[PDB]
Design a protein around this nucleic acid. Structure first.
Ligand SMILES: [Mg+2]
Ligand SMILES: [Mg+2]
Ligand SMILES: [Mg+2]
Ligand SMILES: [Mg+2]
Ligand SMILES: [Mg+2]
Ligand SMILES: [Mg+2]
Ligand SMILES: [Mg+2]
Ligand SMILES: [Mg+2]
Ligand SMILES: [Mg+2]
Ligand SMILES: [Mg+2]
Ligand SMILES: [Mg+2]
Ligand SMILES: [Mg+2]
Ligand SMILES: [Mg+2]
Ligand SMILES: [Mg+2]
Ligand SMILES: [Mg+2]
Ligand SMILES: [Mg+2]
Ligand SMILES: [Mg+2]
Ligand SMILES: [Mg+2]
Ligand SMILES: [Mg+2]
Ligand SMILES: [Mg+2]
Ligand SMILES: [Mg+2]
Ligand SMILES: [Mg+2]
Ligand SMILES: [Mg+2]
Ligand SMILES: [Mg+2]
Ligand SMILES: [Mg+2]
Ligand SMILES: [Mg+2]
Ligand SMILES: [Mg+2]
Ligand SMILES: [Mg+2]
Ligand SMILES: [Mg+2]
Ligand SMILES: [Mg+2]
Ligand SMILES: [Mg+2]
Ligand SMILES: [Mg+2]
Ligand SMILES: [Mg+2]
Ligand SMILES: [Mg+2]
Ligand SMILES: [Zn+2]
Lengths: 204, 58, 138, 37, 175
RNA sequence: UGGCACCUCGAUGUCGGCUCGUCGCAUCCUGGGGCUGAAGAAGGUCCCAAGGGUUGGGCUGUUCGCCCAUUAAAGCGGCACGCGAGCUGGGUUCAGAACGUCGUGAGACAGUUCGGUCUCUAUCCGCCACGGGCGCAGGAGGCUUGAGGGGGGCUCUUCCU
RNA sequence: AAGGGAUAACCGCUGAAAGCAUCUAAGCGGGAAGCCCGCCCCAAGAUGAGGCCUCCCACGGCGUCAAGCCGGUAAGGACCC
């Protein structure tokens, strides 16, 4: 199960032989590994990567002080990529091949305290025809005496977005070796600058 | 008191219903369930009360 | 006030073997050992029901057509969430929840018996990290 | 036939088999087999 | 009345029957088998024959006597290749050619069915119009023959099915 | 539809629609199977199965019901004939007025028609989200397994065979 | 979803009771958009409070003694922009 740390840098169109492909260029550069798990130590046996460089003065040293591999500590979240196993130095893009289906797991855009019509795609009341204040309200939220209480998960307003979102079955278009970039087929979760992990899709 | 007497007499080889049947028939109504403090405090004589109660089954 | 003081000292350790002994009938002497019926110094408010570890939580014998038919119940507050799990699934994986639910259904329900559920460890081994000295009783 | 509450032996070569708790009745011709339910 | 087990075993080419204190293992000139036995009922391993003995008379001692004997009686002739178990196929253009052991066959589908045999099952194919399933144990042959039945269902107003001996009692035509 | 009149007359807002759902199967389809008066397709009936769907319109205030075009289907019910501290007021259960009938008349009709005030502030439970304190038996920075819980759990057409 | 297990209706194999027969009384199977697995996030307030790596740590005074009598301080955290 191949995977990588990446960051969205924007999206555009590429041109194939006949059809244009809505690619997302994504910067999954050289990722230093810092720690390997073990079945005899923790069991689940994952591998811990970290990707983007940090100057050694903003660190606080429970973090500064990892051993020989990746002495220069990275910035972002040291993600473990779930039974992937590299050789030991770094993970480049050439682990991936063009024509493979890759999963992208990132962090989507939080819309704030988003509404119920924008959040759960309701319909609401009409604008005309006497409607007092129902133009964006959800409406009825239950029943009278039996059952009484409102059920759990009634799909009302709250914090829509800003959660870890996985978009799946993305085919690899092109690989850029000199800057270590990837070109997925659109619809990556996350903004311009949102870190993702890119695994292998199954879909066997 | 029934839980203390039934708890203390059980490891001697007889439960509460076996224990009281010797006391009501043998004329040795002494315990009367207020005397659980020999089954708790000093059991070397309450064990002798078990010795007097186990022979009074017939 | 007459001197009926329990004088609580030294909670002890008893492990119970479950090779071929049936549940229920096992869980009643586990119930009286977790309660404290074996001790003559009884007072029902202080927890004197001693530390009991049960070994060999696997292959507990059940009688009749109860395996595959005795279905447990675990409710979620979400609507439609009534996950029905059979006894053969409860013995295929997670064997400890059968005995923990059997002792939980027999202990008292207040903050005393809720504390008594802490004093009952379940292990399908035979191995357990309680390693001072463990006398076995049946 | 099919699932009925009463079970009777049409065309006397029926065999009555109690399998898995409930009663089936079978023959050579499968248009006379019955389940009680 | 004759309860199965009131008449003895005796077997020429006298295969070995051992104790196996809860079960029965039978070793023969071809293969070994396995018969589970209820521990309360006692089958004994004397010279020549294999005796069977039940304690009492209830709904388990009267049927397990006969179950326990008869499942040995299958394993008596089982380990000496006493099962032919033909499967003759009908059809206008149906046949069954064999490549190794996975028996593919044309049963009118858009692809020839590849039958994957289990361990110890021999697909002897002398003819394109009839095959036969051989092995050691009777359960292992009858189960796989039932799997051959699981592809094509016979007696659907005409031919092109299997019958285990050949028995068209199909039903009336529909014109 | 009824019968009863047991809490409710210091009042528990009544029909219908919009939004929002949830549950049962005695299943409308999709998924399996038996029988057939099942040659194949399309069918009829019955058993298991509620996981997901169950259209867009015209008519009337309508639930229901009748038609147009489709689909595989436009299921039956409960949740105070779900839902007015969410909304609508078209009908009915207000005062105006008129029509037909009854009544000498005042007026009345479970007969018809036009119009007719729908009540800013959430205390507690519930729910959607986000927090403070403390705990996690030395104090912190990270990584992460998962006891458990929800989402999705569809389906049609064309071609080869 | 592709795939795995146990399955409902249904189809079985072997086989006595009941020398025959039988899907069942012992067992072994096949068998659904159904159930549990599997995908994704929530999640150790899972007090049952998990696991791993790294940094710091004896007195600096004294009880009802290693703070559970207190003042600064290491790693760190907090205030402010
Ligand atoms: Mg934002
Ligand atoms: Mg709108
Ligand atoms: Mg308005
Ligand atoms: Mg208004
Ligand atoms: Mg309630
Ligand atoms: Mg649901
Ligand atoms: Mg009524
Ligand atoms: Mg009255
Ligand atoms: Mg009042
Ligand atoms: Mg009212
Ligand atoms: Mg009213
Ligand atoms: Mg049904
Ligand atoms: Mg019906
Ligand atoms: Mg069907
Ligand atoms: Mg047909
Ligand atoms: Mg449902
Ligand atoms: Mg539904
Ligand atoms: Mg309403
Ligand atoms: Mg109101
Ligand atoms: Mg209301
Ligand atoms: Mg109105
Ligand atoms: Mg109006
Ligand atoms: Mg008027
Ligand atoms: Mg206002
Ligand atoms: Mg509030
Ligand atoms: Mg908090
Ligand atoms: Mg997590
Ligand atoms: Mg889980
Ligand atoms: Mg919980
Ligand atoms: Mg689930
Ligand atoms: Mg037969
Ligand atoms: Mg069966
Ligand atoms: Mg089965
Ligand atoms: Mg299966
Ligand atoms: Zn018949």
């Amino acid at each position: 199960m191949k995977g990588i740390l990446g960051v969205k840098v924007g999206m555009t169109r590429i041109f194939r032989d006949d059809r244009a492909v809505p690619v997302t260029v994504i910067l999954a550069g050289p990722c230093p590994v810092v720690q390997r798990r073990t079945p005899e130590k923790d069991g689940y046996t994952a591998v811990q990567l970290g990707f983007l460089p940090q100057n050694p003065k903003r660190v606080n040293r429970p973090l500064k002080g990892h051993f020989a591999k990746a002495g220069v500590e990275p910035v972002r979240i040291l993600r473990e990529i779930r039974d992937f196993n590299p050789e030991g130095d770094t993970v480049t893009v050439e682990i991936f091949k063009p024509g493979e289906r890759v999963d992208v797991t990132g962090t989507s855009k939080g819309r704030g305290f988003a509404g119920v019509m924008k959040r759960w795609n309701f319909a609401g009341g009409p604008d005309s025809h006497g409607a007092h204040k129902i133009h964006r309200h959800p409406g009825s939220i239950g029943n009278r005496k039996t059952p009484g209480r409102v059920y759990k998960g009634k799909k009302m307003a709250g914090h829509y977005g800003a959660e870890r979102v996985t978009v799946m079955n993305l085919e690899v278009v092109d690989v850029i070796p000199e800057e270590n970039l990837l070109l997925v087929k659109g619809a990556v979760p996350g903004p311009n600058g949102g870190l993702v992990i890119v695994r292998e899709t199954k879909k066997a | 008191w029934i839980v203390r007497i039934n708890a203390a007499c059980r490891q001697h080889g007889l439960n509460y219903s076996t224990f009281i049947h010797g006391l009501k028939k043998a004329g040795i109504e002494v315990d009367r369930k207020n005397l659980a403090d020999l089954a708790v405090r000093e059991p070397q004589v309450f064990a002798e009360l078990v010795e007097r109660a186990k022979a009074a089954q017939g | 006030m007459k001197t009926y003081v329990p004088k609580q000292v030294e909670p002890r350790w008893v492990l119970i073997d479950a090779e071929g002994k049936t549940l229920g009938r096992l869980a009643t002497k586990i119930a009286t050992l977790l309660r404290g019926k074996h001790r003559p110094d009884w007072t029902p408010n202080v927890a004197m029901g001693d530390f009991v570890v049960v070994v060999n939580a696997d292959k507990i014998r059940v009688t009749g057509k109860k395996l595959e038919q005795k279905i447990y119940t675990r409710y979620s507050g979400y609507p439609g969430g009534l996950k029905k799990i059979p006894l053969e699934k409860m013995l295929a994986t997670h064997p400890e929840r059968v005995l923990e639910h059997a002792v939980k259904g027999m202990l008292p329900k207040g903050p005393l018996g809720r504390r008594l559920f802490k004093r009952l460890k379940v292990y399908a081994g035979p191995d357990h990290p309680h390693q001072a000295q463990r006398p076995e009783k049946l | 036939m099919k699932v009925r509450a009463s079970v009777k032996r049409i065309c006397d070569k029926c065999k009555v088999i109690r399998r898995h708790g409930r009663v089936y009745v079978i023959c050579e011709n499968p248009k006379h087999k019955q389940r009680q339910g | 009345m004759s309860r199965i087990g009131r008449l003895p075993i005796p077997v020429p080419k006298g295969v070995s029957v051992e104790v196996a204190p809860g079960r029965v293992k039978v070793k023969g000139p071809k293969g070994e088998l396995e018969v589970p036995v209820s521990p309360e009922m006692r089958v004994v391993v004397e010279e020549g024959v294999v005796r069977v003995e039940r304690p009492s008379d209830e709904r388990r001692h009267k049927s397990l006597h006969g179950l326990t004997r008869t499942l040995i009686a299958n394993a008596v002739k089982g380990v000496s290749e006493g099962y032919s178990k033909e499967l003759l196929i009908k059809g206008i253009g149906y046949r069954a050619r064999l490549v190794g052991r996975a028996l593919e066959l044309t049963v009118g589908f858009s692809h020839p069915v590849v039958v994957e045999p289990p361990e110890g099952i021999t697909f002897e194919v002398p003819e394109p119009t009839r095959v036969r399933v051989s092995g050691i144990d009777k359960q292992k042959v009858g189960q796989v023959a039932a799997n051959i039945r699981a592809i094509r269902k016979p007696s659907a107003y005409h031919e092109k099915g299997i019958y285990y001996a050949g028995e068209p009692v199909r039903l009336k035509p529909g014109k």
